[PDB]
């Protein structure tokens, strides 16, 4: 027989029909990834949660030489185990402090001013505008520059590094390594500036070195937090914007009841299709999952949108609903590798969307949603441009 | 039977197989355009040249209400007849003077400095780089700002207007009009600045008004020359860059024999697939073309890549050849509507490519060519990003 192909459709404004078929017919399914390797794709909520919470399915080992892959590695293999290294070298406190919105008491107001500065610029020029290049991208880059303690002068160059680093390729491509060492050197340069960095992660790193871990490791943590955070928050915010543009009753709700923003972002997180690949794990032992015997060394892929649209857990999953009794979604993952920046991720989006619905109350797409250009060959699903009117 | 669909593949680094099949099997072919309308697609060189040179096939009338269309009009219908209006209002001299590289004796050196400034910035940051956002786009925008006599401060906003204005849509979309009047107002504002514009097209327009045509018409000419010129030169240069990256022997030729740049750009023009739609005409009378009787009022579409790859006129058309005995290509069209800026278009590309092969002698793509993202739904074919190493 012929295996289902993975990944699924690049279109991000509706659940791929194949994700619903996989969950209903084979919630654990043998698929052929873009590399030609085979994998177990897990698409029901119950089994996805199980995999994430069972440490016999290893994220760290997905980077090992010889294992099957959903796409070529574009970063050093130790970086897939970023949190595992952050913990072992005594970096966790500096990292966890940086990721905590409660440790930066100005963050809230500063993010709000950043959002409004960007939106005011767009309003001055008049519609239409591209809310990716004109809003999400600079806003997400500005946040992560603040997190690291670096200026925003080179934010376009840094976001362009993300455009290469998060490519999904069937085979390794020259360029991934060149791109990695390019921005690793950038981070080293910032850490080792004569007027040594204060503020943010690089400021904490500078202090940590003078106390009684190498420069390459410090910059690696800085670079991978910048790239992973900026690309994930920018892509999620783009998906959230599309929802509020296509469903203006949701923006009316946010304007009428500003305090629902927390629940609203929690539901947009469940709904959002920005994860354009699956969460990967290598089985370290034989494990039975659902009706399938998974053998040690095989690749397991957790399909987050399959789980988050599972009607056994989320009634009317295809309908955005800010008033669900229960919303135990997997948008941030689960288990050991649950997103350590989930609070910052929520803050980023809540503040941006609050500013957006206030400043652009007639927000709508400037063209039918089916004519958005969805980026191919990337870890995230995202529109190449997000043209809107207001 | 089922008609062939138009447009053809968005992939721009190889001729679409369908373009070769159409030319060989039905060089005048009934096709279904993206609007659902029907058209005559002309794909052989002999018949394409015939249409372009026969004024019974009208460009001006392609904008008329009720006529069949290859895609929705995104601009006022009078703007499709831009040159026809420029001529009638006594604007031709100011326009033709602006479009002449010989009327701006600093242009050559200035373009060369612009190219090298952009490339030096990329070299300082190190590879990889996106040569669209980092080179073609700002270089093409800088040229057209110079042409008009406006500063480059808002070049990103202006190129984003191009991203909307040149969309191909099956039906009219809100946004096209909003976008047009947005940048029309921008051009009015520049023309009507208190420190009145000197220099360029707006400087000539300001003088022309005080002499013994409205503000809207003047800004319309400015806006449509900016958009058409910037989008066409940027897209062509991107296609030329891909060729020199994929065929480094061509860059060796340019470095060894700098004076061949004129012939080299002439061949890259024949080869280039940046025109992603066809040149449209409405038949004003019944005309027999090839084996087909075309009736008055029908839509005729000239497929430039079919003509420019016609082996009856260009031997080994699939192979770039800087030493062809004869190269009567249709990259700039033909007949009455032949590109009035062809000399500027050649200068733009010749200077950029000369700088490129000097500054990035090891230029190559940073990923297999098949993994470039080609933009959908646009008049031009272009890679969304052009990542390169050197
Ligand atoms: C809307 C925003 C975000 C979403 C949807 C998101 C989602 C996720 C998901 C699904 C995982 C689990 C991956 C797996 O299990 O294989 C994860 C892990 C991770 N994310 Fe987030 N992320 C977001 C923002 C951020 C931010 C702001 C940062 C950093 C500044 C960040 C840093 C990380 C790191 C370091 C990990 C790995 C954790 C580990 O391996 O233990 N993320 N994220
Ligand atoms: C590499 C660059 C360029 C290419 C490949 C190109 C190609 C063409 C083609 C194929 C046509 C004929 C359209 C038809 O017959 O329907 C045309 C027309 C035109 N182009 Fe160019 N173009 C380029 C650059 C420019 C520049 C730099 C400008 C302006 C600054 C410009 C302005 C125009 C105008 C106004 C027309 C309409 C002429 C008429 O209707 O009589 N183009 N171009
Ligand atoms: O910290 C990490 N932990 C895991 C899981 C993970 C966290 N955030 C992600 C966002 C997308 C994909 C995977 C992850 C990982 O795989 N790598 C990095 C992040 C990263 C930095 N640059 C990259 C280029 C390519 C892929 C990942 C990264
Ligand atoms: O001057 C023009 N003459 C014709 C032919 C033409 C010249 N250069 C082109 C480049 C692409 C497509 C058509 C043309 C036309 O159609 N319009 C305009 C150009 C233009 C300004 N903005 C636009 C948005 C959309 C489409 C065209 C324009
Ligand atoms: N595999 C994967 N891991 C992530 N961690 C955070 N975001 C993502 C994503 O899109 N894919
Ligand atoms: N139809 C059409 N006309 C043009 N004139 C200049 N460039 C183009 C193009 O790509 N398409």
PDB file of C-alpha atoms and ligand atoms in Angstrom, chain A residues 74-75 79-80 82 165-166 224 228 232 379, ligand 3:
ATOM      1  CA  UNK A  74      19.597  22.789  10.366  1.00  0.00           C
ATOM      2  CA  UNK A  75      21.252  23.355  13.768  1.00  0.00           C
ATOM      3  CA  UNK A  79      20.727  22.533  20.310  1.00  0.00           C
ATOM      4  CA  UNK A  80      17.643  20.319  19.936  1.00  0.00           C
ATOM      5  CA  UNK A  82      18.686  23.196  24.500  1.00  0.00           C
ATOM      6  CA  UNK A 165      17.235  28.442  10.137  1.00  0.00           C
ATOM      7  CA  UNK A 166      13.644  27.132  10.235  1.00  0.00           C
ATOM      8  CA  UNK A 224      18.231  29.539  19.867  1.00  0.00           C
ATOM      9  CA  UNK A 228      12.600  29.911  18.503  1.00  0.00           C
ATOM     10  CA  UNK A 232       6.808  31.119  17.230  1.00  0.00           C
ATOM     11  CA  UNK A 379       8.612  24.711  10.208  1.00  0.00           C
TER      12      UNK A 379
HETATM   13  O1  LIG C   3      15.560  25.149  21.899  1.00  0.00           O
HETATM   14  C1  LIG C   3      15.252  24.306  21.045  1.00  0.00           C
HETATM   15  N1  LIG C   3      14.592  23.190  21.334  1.00  0.00           N
HETATM   16  C2  LIG C   3      14.047  22.235  20.375  1.00  0.00           C
HETATM   17  C3  LIG C   3      12.503  22.349  20.346  1.00  0.00           C
HETATM   18  C4  LIG C   3      11.945  23.646  19.830  1.00  0.00           C
HETATM   19  C5  LIG C   3      11.690  24.765  20.575  1.00  0.00           C
HETATM   20  N2  LIG C   3      11.186  25.759  19.777  1.00  0.00           N
HETATM   21  C6  LIG C   3      11.092  25.304  18.486  1.00  0.00           C
HETATM   22  C7  LIG C   3      10.624  25.940  17.335  1.00  0.00           C
HETATM   23  C8  LIG C   3      10.649  25.220  16.160  1.00  0.00           C
HETATM   24  C9  LIG C   3      11.113  23.902  16.121  1.00  0.00           C
HETATM   25  C10 LIG C   3      11.564  23.269  17.261  1.00  0.00           C
HETATM   26  C11 LIG C   3      11.558  23.971  18.474  1.00  0.00           C
HETATM   27  C12 LIG C   3      14.637  22.369  18.983  1.00  0.00           C
HETATM   28  O2  LIG C   3      14.375  21.513  18.124  1.00  0.00           O
HETATM   29  N3  LIG C   3      15.436  23.401  18.738  1.00  0.00           N
HETATM   30  C13 LIG C   3      15.633  24.558  19.602  1.00  0.00           C
HETATM   31  C14 LIG C   3      14.879  25.792  19.047  1.00  0.00           C
HETATM   32  C15 LIG C   3      15.472  26.255  17.751  1.00  0.00           C
HETATM   33  C16 LIG C   3      16.312  27.321  17.583  1.00  0.00           C
HETATM   34  N4  LIG C   3      16.675  27.423  16.262  1.00  0.00           N
HETATM   35  C17 LIG C   3      16.075  26.415  15.546  1.00  0.00           C
HETATM   36  C18 LIG C   3      16.126  26.122  14.185  1.00  0.00           C
HETATM   37  C19 LIG C   3      15.397  25.038  13.750  1.00  0.00           C
HETATM   38  C20 LIG C   3      14.636  24.263  14.627  1.00  0.00           C
HETATM   39  C21 LIG C   3      14.580  24.554  15.972  1.00  0.00           C
HETATM   40  C22 LIG C   3      15.303  25.654  16.450  1.00  0.00           C
END
